[PDB]
Design an enzyme around this catalytic site. Sequence first.
Site, PDB file in Angstrom:
ATOM      1  N   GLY B 136       0.814  -1.157   0.000  1.00 47.11           N
ATOM      2  CA  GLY B 136       0.000   0.000   0.000  1.00 47.11           C
ATOM      3  C   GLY B 136       0.867   1.233   0.000  1.00 47.11           C
ATOM      4  O   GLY B 136       0.433   2.266  -0.365  1.00 47.11           O
ATOM      5  N   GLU B 368      -3.792   7.312   1.279  1.00 45.58           N
ATOM      6  CA  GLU B 368      -3.131   8.257   0.395  1.00 45.58           C
ATOM      7  C   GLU B 368      -1.702   8.512   0.855  1.00 45.58           C
ATOM      8  O   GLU B 368      -1.130   9.578   0.630  1.00 45.58           O
ATOM      9  CB  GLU B 368      -3.945   9.540   0.270  1.00 45.58           C
ATOM     10  CG  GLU B 368      -5.383   9.215  -0.087  1.00 45.58           C
ATOM     11  CD  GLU B 368      -6.013  10.254  -0.957  1.00 45.58           C
ATOM     12  OE1 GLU B 368      -5.258  11.083  -1.494  1.00 45.58           O
ATOM     13  OE2 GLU B 368      -7.258  10.247  -1.089  1.00 45.58           O
ATOM     14  N   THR B 370       0.785   6.859   4.150  1.00 44.38           N
ATOM     15  CA  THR B 370       0.863   7.042   5.586  1.00 44.38           C
ATOM     16  C   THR B 370       1.674   8.283   5.930  1.00 44.38           C
ATOM     17  O   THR B 370       2.384   8.869   5.104  1.00 44.38           O
ATOM     18  CB  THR B 370       1.524   5.846   6.268  1.00 44.38           C
ATOM     19  OG1 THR B 370       2.866   5.686   5.769  1.00 44.38           O
ATOM     20  CG2 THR B 370       0.730   4.602   6.043  1.00 44.38           C
TER      21      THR B 370
HETATM   22  C1  LIG Z   1      -9.916   2.975   4.951  1.00 40.25           C
HETATM   23  C2  LIG Z   1      -8.967   2.814   3.843  1.00 40.25           C
HETATM   24  C3  LIG Z   1      -9.265   3.218   2.603  1.00 40.25           C
HETATM   25  C4  LIG Z   1      -8.351   3.074   1.632  1.00 40.25           C
HETATM   26  N1  LIG Z   1      -8.676   3.458   0.436  1.00 40.25           N
HETATM   27  C5  LIG Z   1      -7.834   3.305  -0.546  1.00 40.25           C
HETATM   28  C6  LIG Z   1      -8.153   3.698  -1.882  1.00 40.25           C
HETATM   29  O1  LIG Z   1      -9.191   4.154  -2.154  1.00 40.25           O
HETATM   30  N2  LIG Z   1      -7.280   3.528  -2.802  1.00 40.25           N
HETATM   31  C7  LIG Z   1      -6.119   2.972  -2.546  1.00 40.25           C
HETATM   32  O2  LIG Z   1      -5.348   2.839  -3.456  1.00 40.25           O
HETATM   33  N3  LIG Z   1      -5.739   2.577  -1.369  1.00 40.25           N
HETATM   34  C8  LIG Z   1      -6.505   2.741  -0.358  1.00 40.25           C
HETATM   35  N4  LIG Z   1      -6.122   2.333   0.876  1.00 40.25           N
HETATM   36  C9  LIG Z   1      -4.823   1.773   1.019  1.00 40.25           C
HETATM   37  C10 LIG Z   1      -3.943   2.657   1.879  1.00 40.25           C
HETATM   38  O3  LIG Z   1      -3.427   3.725   1.160  1.00 40.25           O
HETATM   39  C11 LIG Z   1      -2.795   1.919   2.542  1.00 40.25           C
HETATM   40  O4  LIG Z   1      -3.278   1.247   3.644  1.00 40.25           O
HETATM   41  C12 LIG Z   1      -1.638   2.795   3.038  1.00 40.25           C
HETATM   42  O5  LIG Z   1      -0.894   3.446   2.045  1.00 40.25           O
HETATM   43  C13 LIG Z   1      -0.631   2.049   3.843  1.00 40.25           C
HETATM   44  O6  LIG Z   1      -0.231   0.947   3.156  1.00 40.25           O
HETATM   45  P1  LIG Z   1      -0.368  -0.434   3.689  1.00 40.25           P
HETATM   46  O7  LIG Z   1      -1.525  -0.591   4.335  1.00 40.25           O
HETATM   47  O8  LIG Z   1      -0.182  -1.350   2.694  1.00 40.25           O
HETATM   48  O9  LIG Z   1       0.709  -0.598   4.771  1.00 40.25           O
HETATM   49  P2  LIG Z   1       2.241  -0.792   4.671  1.00 40.25           P
HETATM   50  O10 LIG Z   1       2.753  -0.183   3.511  1.00 40.25           O
HETATM   51  O11 LIG Z   1       2.470  -2.108   4.961  1.00 40.25           O
HETATM   52  O12 LIG Z   1       2.617   0.046   5.850  1.00 40.25           O
HETATM   53  C14 LIG Z   1       2.927  -0.421   7.129  1.00 40.25           C
HETATM   54  C15 LIG Z   1       3.750   0.556   7.896  1.00 40.25           C
HETATM   55  O13 LIG Z   1       5.040   0.614   7.404  1.00 40.25           O
HETATM   56  C16 LIG Z   1       5.362   1.910   7.094  1.00 40.25           C
HETATM   57  N5  LIG Z   1       6.110   1.971   5.873  1.00 40.25           N
HETATM   58  C17 LIG Z   1       5.835   1.537   4.695  1.00 40.25           C
HETATM   59  N6  LIG Z   1       6.772   1.795   3.863  1.00 40.25           N
HETATM   60  C18 LIG Z   1       7.666   2.396   4.518  1.00 40.25           C
HETATM   61  C19 LIG Z   1       8.967   2.953   4.236  1.00 40.25           C
HETATM   62  N7  LIG Z   1       9.500   2.907   3.047  1.00 40.25           N
HETATM   63  N8  LIG Z   1       9.591   3.505   5.224  1.00 40.25           N
HETATM   64  C20 LIG Z   1       9.115   3.553   6.405  1.00 40.25           C
HETATM   65  N9  LIG Z   1       7.957   3.093   6.723  1.00 40.25           N
HETATM   66  C21 LIG Z   1       7.221   2.523   5.834  1.00 40.25           C
HETATM   67  C22 LIG Z   1       4.089   2.650   6.919  1.00 40.25           C
HETATM   68  O14 LIG Z   1       4.129   3.995   7.183  1.00 40.25           O
HETATM   69  C23 LIG Z   1       3.246   1.969   7.904  1.00 40.25           C
HETATM   70  O15 LIG Z   1       3.449   2.404   9.233  1.00 40.25           O
HETATM   71  C24 LIG Z   1      -7.040   2.485   1.891  1.00 40.25           C
HETATM   72  C25 LIG Z   1      -6.760   2.088   3.126  1.00 40.25           C
HETATM   73  C26 LIG Z   1      -7.667   2.226   4.113  1.00 40.25           C
HETATM   74  C27 LIG Z   1      -7.313   1.789   5.458  1.00 40.25           C
END
Ligand SMILES: Cc1cc2nc3c(=O)[nH]c(=O)nc-3n(C[C@H](O)[C@H](O)[C@H](O)COP(=O)(O)OP(=O)(O)OC[C@H]3O[C@@H](n4cnc5c(N)ncnc54)[C@H](O)[C@@H]3O)c2cc1C
Lengths: 385, 387, 383, 385
Positions: B136, B368, B370
Amino acid sequence: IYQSVELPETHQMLLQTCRDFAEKELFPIAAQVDKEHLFPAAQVKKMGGLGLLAMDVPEELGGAGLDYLAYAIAMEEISRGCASTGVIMSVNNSLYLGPILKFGSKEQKQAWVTPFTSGDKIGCFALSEPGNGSDAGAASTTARAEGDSWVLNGTKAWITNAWEASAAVVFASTDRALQNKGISAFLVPMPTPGLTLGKKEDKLGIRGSSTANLIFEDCRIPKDSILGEPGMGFKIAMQTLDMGRIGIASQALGIAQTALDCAVNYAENRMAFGAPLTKLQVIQFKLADMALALESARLLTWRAAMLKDNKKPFIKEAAMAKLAASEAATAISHQAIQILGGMGYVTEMPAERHYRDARITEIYEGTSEIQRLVIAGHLLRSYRS
Amino acid sequence: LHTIYQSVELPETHQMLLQTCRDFAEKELFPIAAQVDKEHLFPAAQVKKMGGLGLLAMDVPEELGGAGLDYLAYAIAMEEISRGCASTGVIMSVNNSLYLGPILKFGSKEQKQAWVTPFTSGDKIGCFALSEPGNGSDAGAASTTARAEGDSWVLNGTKAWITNAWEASAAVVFASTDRALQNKGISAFLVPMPTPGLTLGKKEDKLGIRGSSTANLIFEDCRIPKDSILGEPGMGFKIAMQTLDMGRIGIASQALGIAQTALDCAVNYAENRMAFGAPLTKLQVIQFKLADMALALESARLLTWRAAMLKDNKKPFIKEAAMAKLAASEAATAISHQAIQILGGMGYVTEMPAERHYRDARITEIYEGTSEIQRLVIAGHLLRSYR
Amino acid sequence: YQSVELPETHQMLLQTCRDFAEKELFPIAAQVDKEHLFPAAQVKKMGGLGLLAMDVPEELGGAGLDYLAYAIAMEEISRGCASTGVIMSVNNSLYLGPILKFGSKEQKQAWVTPFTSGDKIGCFALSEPGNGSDAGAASTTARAEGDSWVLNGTKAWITNAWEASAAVVFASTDRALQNKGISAFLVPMPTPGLTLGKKEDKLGIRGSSTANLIFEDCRIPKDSILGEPGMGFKIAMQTLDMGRIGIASQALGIAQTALDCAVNYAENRMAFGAPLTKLQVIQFKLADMALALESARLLTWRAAMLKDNKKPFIKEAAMAKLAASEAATAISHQAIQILGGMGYVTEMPAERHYRDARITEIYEGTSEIQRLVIAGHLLRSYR
Amino acid sequence: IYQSVELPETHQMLLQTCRDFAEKELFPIAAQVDKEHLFPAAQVKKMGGLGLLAMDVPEELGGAGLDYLAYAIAMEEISRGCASTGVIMSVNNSLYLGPILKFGSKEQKQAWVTPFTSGDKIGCFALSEPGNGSDAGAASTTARAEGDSWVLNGTKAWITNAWEASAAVVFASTDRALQNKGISAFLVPMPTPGLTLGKKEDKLGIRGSSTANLIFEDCRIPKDSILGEPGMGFKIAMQTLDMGRIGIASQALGIAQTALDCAVNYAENRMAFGAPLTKLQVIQFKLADMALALESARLLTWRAAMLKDNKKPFIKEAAMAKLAASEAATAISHQAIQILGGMGYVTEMPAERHYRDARITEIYEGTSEIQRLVIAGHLLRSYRS
Ligand SMILES: Cc1cc2nc3c(=O)[nH]c(=O)nc-3n(C[C@H](O)[C@H](O)[C@H](O)COP(=O)(O)OP(=O)(O)OC[C@H]3O[C@@H](n4cnc5c(N)ncnc54)[C@H](O)[C@@H]3O)c2cc1C
Ligand SMILES: Cc1cc2nc3c(=O)[nH]c(=O)nc-3n(C[C@H](O)[C@H](O)[C@H](O)COP(=O)(O)OP(=O)(O)OC[C@H]3O[C@@H](n4cnc5c(N)ncnc54)[C@H](O)[C@@H]3O)c2cc1C
Ligand SMILES: Cc1cc2nc3c(=O)[nH]c(=O)nc-3n(C[C@H](O)[C@H](O)[C@H](O)COP(=O)(O)OP(=O)(O)OC[C@H]3O[C@@H](n4cnc5c(N)ncnc54)[C@H](O)[C@@H]3O)c2cc1C
Ligand SMILES: Cc1cc2nc3c(=O)[nH]c(=O)nc-3n(C[C@H](O)[C@H](O)[C@H](O)COP(=O)(O)OP(=O)(O)OC[C@H]3O[C@@H](n4cnc5c(N)ncnc54)[C@H](O)[C@@H]3O)c2cc1C
């Protein structure tokens, strides 16, 4: 996961058996307890059998005869399992049994403590009102002497266990003009004529505990229902809250610990750029700050518990513990949700629940603000000493 | 467009638009916010009324059925709307920034006519399928593939977390057209919903923004016309990143609204609640909380309006959008956290909207990109600025 | 135990060191900072009291105490004077610490004992201009030649550089082995081939000397090596684990004295009719300073007791150091804040507490490094 | 660099002109101005000739004819060079010339503004007193009317530019019984009979600025010395502080900017663990947080400035600007030190100076606490509107 400072084997084993209990009996029911706002009746019963609902209570009254360090440890371990189960247990131990322990007669303890040590009956603690929570001394629920009876009128608010308690420690003004020298404590049976339970609160979290108003309309209880003498109700409420704050501190530790557990375990298996989140320095720092917040808050919690156990003053320490642990629980749970990313926001992970559960630890048994007031007053007193 | 003073006194079109949206949110969204939250209910009729008002297509040229407004207008409107309902706001924000946004910016005239115009009035909303279950945070790594097959692309893979998944009639979908080119191998695709080959996963059960649907888009050998690609192949990374930049302005504004209504709730409550003989607002710590909330909020708004305005003035705004979204999201949680605190017991229960604002704010730090991502985006561009 | 009844020895030691600090350090702390004055006389008296060699056994001339005692003394000493604190901390943990735990009988006799009474103090040379946090990147080299180790390289930021008579020096006996290539060397000061850099003009702890150790073809005997070649990194790290308890306690002292200043000042400063302590935000500030200080103290004591009980304490040492250091900055920032304008000038000690606190977030492993250290051990315990 | 919607070409050129002046004239002396607590007389006069000491002052009166947005930009660029030069300049613009421009008669402007626009004479601002720095409406210093003269008695505390100023705006009670409403503001020449300067304060930072009490003993000044009408002094002090807080916010921006400058350049050029510091995520995060906090505070600052320029209310916004920027300056300067590591603790680098300079911005012209009180006050009164 921390380093037990120097724990005695009794509390080591207590931690393990509680952890075992929480992981076996609480971890699998925590999601249903929260989503179905379901009181964990069966588990509370089994906890009572284990002496967890009456830890500080002497065995000859049916309790486990342990100490508040034990209580803090059990409370953290149970609340790690289920925050609702935790506060349910905390109310019974600290807020209900505690004042009856500290202030009852033999007769009162035999009739109101002992039947509430095994899990068949739990109690609750009715101090707050709709108009006043932090301003506890503003209690406007009245108790009027009439005949062989106290006549109670008013609404108690936010009573945890309201819908499951068989007895209440109720604080009412026996004279409002006396202010917080006019509060008295009353052992009230539940149910009892004159006592209506309000609607259950629809809560952000600890959704497995009932929270509801106790509504007294001409509620008549025996005159010997008073706990202590007329007017010492405020000091009863305050000292009960001092001990209870250790329980909420430990509840907050539980929520914090389980949120950290969830964040770690998820970060070790969630993959980013080819490697676990725990390879990301940013995730590492979060984990480190969570651990530090949590272990810091635990040391404070243990300190307060240990002080209370050793009959040393502990009001400041209990407040610091409650304050630190509660703000840790929110901070940790917030960061657990964050470490889980999208998964932190959804119900198929427990993190959003810990965040919701954490939130309450900053509020009841004295808000963070009240805790800081309590701390500052005692810090200042100690300096003028 | 946009003067610097416009940051300080809104042009009166924007001031009017603020009042209009506040009025709409107060009359239409405030009364249903709890219901939308409690019942996880998509606010279809309100989305439609907003569509009629142009709020679902603000930046869209009037030629294409939009309001012909700007991002400053959108930020203002997203704030007022999300102040009413965070779900509505996100629904609105996805449609404006995440669905319409990339199409206005990268689509052909024909794609805008077919994919923007029928999504400007609240009858159909879009969604944005960039995240995947395994990723994500990296907009450069889609495992969902798009293979060219004659007059069509064939999409295969599961996009994760799609807001509006269960209500969108179309999706901007990012798929890998060339796995080997990694981040140079992603493409953007306009995908009809429903369509053969597209299954929706179950609605996610969320902490907040409960009125919005969130579900996976499961593409199992899903064919879409060839001209459904947004831009050229390989432009998906840039499209996603540039869409996320605009979207962050929308999310920041969403967080402004959550924060503003939490602050509104806190102030109204602190002014009307007594403790120790006086109103909570007589307590110095309460005053300091409200001050900190207002400061956090107005800061985040200035950051948000700056991002919007830079976009309006055809300026780079990656760092400023990320700052906006980061600041407002963290302010929204802190302000909403403190609103709960100010309400005391009331902040924990549904009698009051504060715990909803807490739950709702929580998402703005996640989606959008984190907060961590926002900080990475900010650092990377801050450093670029010095280089 | 912690707050919960400190053992009698420690309580006595606390009173002893509080007596010392208030009687001997409090009057000179401002002068020490303002004149960047090494508190030689005070350090000598402290040496007499066993405070420069607390964990050291009685046989070697030490106080025979433990790290709980050390930490307590460190807090009380640093409450009096932060520079005096770090001077004592370097000698105890950073210099004597590694020689006790890794030196031969002969090295302990020659290098511990003459450094237990305040007549001579040591220092600890790990960081270098190119690397402090990256301790393992030590590029100062030690080459065996004949009966002698040949040391070449600059060590940076060496506390007590200008007063110490021995340095535990970390030089790479083979940079290709990275932090398996580092060795620890007992280096007398002064000694040929060793030049002192100029004193750092420091933000605070201005009574400590801080200066580079420049080794140019500096030959020490082959048996100057602490432990075996390659052990230097673990010697450095284990020394820092102990040292972090000392700095945590220095931070506790700075924090505590900043809090003392703040409480005392707010008790007597009037605003809008009454003392500053009647103002709610002042109470919250004080509450938060007290909570920060006490929790960090508990962490400090936890760590200390862990080490005393021969238990692992890397995470706990790091947690104590991080929490106490950030509390000391936070508390001393708010002590300043509580003093208003008086917080910014030398009529009050607050601005100095602020300046002294700041270093505790940096040396003996930055907060960032500490957080990495905490993260690593947290994660390892889950695995 | 940061971005803005636009700067007016005037303000862009001014930014460069000031940045060029700060890097060329202030950057080389800033360490020495701090270390030797050396009043940058020559730089102040050069700034006087540029208009920087009289920026919002009508050109008619010898000022730059610019506005508070320009002033905020210039304050930041100047304070980015030297925090002492910044405050010396802020005091003159906001605290000295400001109230005279806003409340003085045309004659008072001619006599007291114009000779202070070019760097030969700078003013100061004497509101605080030893027993009162946070209460702009409780001056113990008195001004008794004696016919066509005023007689000042009492000590003003902490006067920036005390030992260099040729004039002070002095607040003294002309009717102590009237408290809040019995303060008046006075133009006092310096030196003048009855005015003794206290010993210079020895400060954590802005050590190039002088800070001394103004001891008034039967200090007689012409009747025409009163700024506005008697009793207006509290309003004059408060509205002067509103302007001044924009200046201090701006000073904090510059300190914050130069600290972030220092930290960014250092982290891009310092290696650790085989890579520059800026490849470390936590350094990136610090930098991001510093940048956000900086640019956020700047937006707040420019909002207050533009509100002033547009003759809109800006008490809350000036307080917010000063609050956010002062706290940004301290956090950013703190984090800059951290990023520099040991280098951040020593005069080899300017980080430690920025830390020390930043600290004052949270104190004078209203502590952070008072800012928050001011914010709270106007937020509430906005709500009650
Ligand atoms: C309610 C909801 C609606 C959503 N709607 C949409 C949508 O409409 N369209 C869409 O495309 N997506 C959507 N998402 C996806 C959302 O954007 C992702 O959940 C978000 O970007 C975080 O990605 P992830 O969940 O995969 O977590 P991960 O990427 O696994 O993140 C886990 C943690 O690791 C950290 N992390 C990740 N990468 C790094 C890095 N390089 N360095 C340091 N820390 C890092 C993050 O900050 C976070 O704390 C939605 C999510 C939710 C919860
Ligand atoms: C889930 C739940 C369970 C509860 N269970 C129980 C229970 O079992 N028994 C029971 O007796 N009570 C219970 N309560 C009530 C609880 O303790 C109160 O919520 C709490 O004390 C705060 O009271 P309040 O709601 O009245 O808030 P208020 O008192 O109205 O507090 C409002 C705000 O003002 C602040 N505030 C109040 N006074 C001051 C002050 N002097 N200075 C600064 N700030 C101040 C508070 O910190 C808070 O931020 C429960 C509440 C909840 C939410
Ligand atoms: C007053 C003073 C006294 C000192 N006394 C001694 C002494 O007696 N003996 C001795 O051996 N040393 C001593 N030092 C050195 C001190 O310990 C170092 O400053 C510190 O350990 C590392 O900082 P550095 O200066 O090399 O900066 P760097 O190591 O370059 O650190 C730069 C920045 O990177 C940050 N960072 C963030 N993440 C990471 C990461 N993953 N890896 C590395 N850095 C990271 C650091 O936290 C810091 O902010 C002293 C320093 C000072 C200021
Ligand atoms: C370097 C320097 C230069 C200065 N230059 C000038 C100058 O040119 N002109 C001038 O007039 N003054 C000047 N001052 C004075 C400065 O404005 C005051 O120091 C500042 O306003 C704080 O006042 P105080 O020092 O009396 O602290 P106090 O007012 O005693 O404040 C002590 C603490 O109490 C808090 N506090 C005070 N009142 C309240 C309240 N009602 N509620 C909650 N908390 C409260 C404060 O925030 C602070 O934390 C200067 C001061 C310094 C340090």
